[PDB]
């Protein structure tokens, strides 16, 4: 879970600071031992392990956003009335927005935590000023989408009500054809069961 990761990052960075102190100076035991070339190579392994966790969403933030941007691009198209076909394609974006709007808001909470918990147990800033700007840069579009979508839903409804009339009319036609096909198939499946060979081979 996304709170467990948070806790692991904070523990891993307590582990860094502990490991750094821990190497300790050149300790003498009859012969002199130098741990200076090792201490460095631990810190190298340590940083890589910490990086993965800190870089976990670094990649995903770009790929999420990249996916989040199209949803915006979809909205930027717009237009009211005009061709019926454009709606059919545009309508699906509303159906995906609703399910997203709900499930994304749930997934929005721990993603925000995911940024903050790194900042706490990462002294170094990731992408410098870019990462704080992106959070602000997402929030605005997210709000802009939620306004544009509510405008679309209102228009969507008026016309999809005209479609929801043509859907049933077409649906009744198809359902009637489907039921007829359901019956014919149940006749054909019964025919092969009724027919007993009895000796007879191959033809069965």
Residue 81: what are its φ and ψ, rounded to 5°?
A: 60, -150
Q: Which two tokens stand for residue 71?
A: 């949803």
State how far the Cα of 95 lies from the Cα of 160, in Å rounded to an integer.
12
- Pairing status of strand 28-29 against strand 31-32: antiparallel
Residues 57 and 116: beta-carbon distance below 8 Å: no
d(CA 167, CA 161): 10
What 63-66 contacts at long range (C-beta under 8 Å, 24+ apart), as own/partner pairs, is 64/111, 65/134, 65/138
- Measure the CA–CA gap between 97 and 146, rounded to whole angstroms: 9
Break-preceding residues in the chain (C–N over 2.5 Å) = 198
> Could you tell me which of 97, 86, 204 has the C-alpha nearest to residue 145?
97
Q: What is the DSSP track for 70-109?
A: HHHHHHHH---SS-HHHHHHHHHHHHHHHHHHHHHHHHHH
Residue given tokens 């009335």 in the structure block? 81
DSSP letter string, 100-166: HHHHHHHHHHHHHHHHHHHHHT-SSPSTTTHHHHHHHHHHHHHHHHHHHHHHHHHHHHHHHHHHHHH
Element (DSSP H or E) covering residue 21: helix 2-22
Which residues lie below 8 Å from residue 31, measured CB to CB, with a gap of 6+? none
* Experiment type: cryo-EM
This structure's resolution (Å) is: 4.0
CB–CB of 146/101 below 8 Å? Answer: yes
Query: For residue 45, what is the DSSP state?
Result: H
* Tokens (6 digits) for 202: 């191959």
């Amino acid at each position: 879970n996304l709170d467990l990761f948070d806790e692991k990052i904070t523990h891993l960075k307590a582990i860094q600071q502990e490991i750094s102190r821990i190497k300790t100076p050149e300790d003498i035991s009859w012969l002199r031992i130098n741990l200076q070339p090792m201490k460095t190579a631990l810190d190298a392994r340590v940083t890589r392990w910490i990086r993965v966790y800190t870089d976990f969403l670094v990649n995903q933030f770009r790929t999420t956003q990249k996916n989040l941007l199209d949803f915006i691009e979809k909205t930027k198209d717009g237009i009211k009335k005009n061709p019926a076909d454009h709606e059919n394609l545009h309508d699906k974006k509303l159906l995906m927005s609703v399910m997203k709007v709900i499930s994304d808001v749930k997934d929005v909470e721990p993603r925000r935590e995911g940024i903050i918990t790194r900042m706490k147990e990462m002294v170094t800033k990731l992408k410098k000023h870019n990462v704080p700007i992106t959070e602000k840069g997402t929030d605005d579009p997210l709000q802009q989408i939620d306004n544009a979508n509510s405008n679309f839903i209102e228009i969507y409804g008026r016309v999809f009500k005209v479609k929801a009339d043509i859907i049933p009319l077409q649906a009744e036609e198809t359902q009637n054809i489907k039921r007829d096909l359901d019956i014919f198939m149940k006749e054909v499946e019964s025919f092969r069961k009724e027919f007993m060979q009895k000796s007879m081979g191959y033809e069965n």
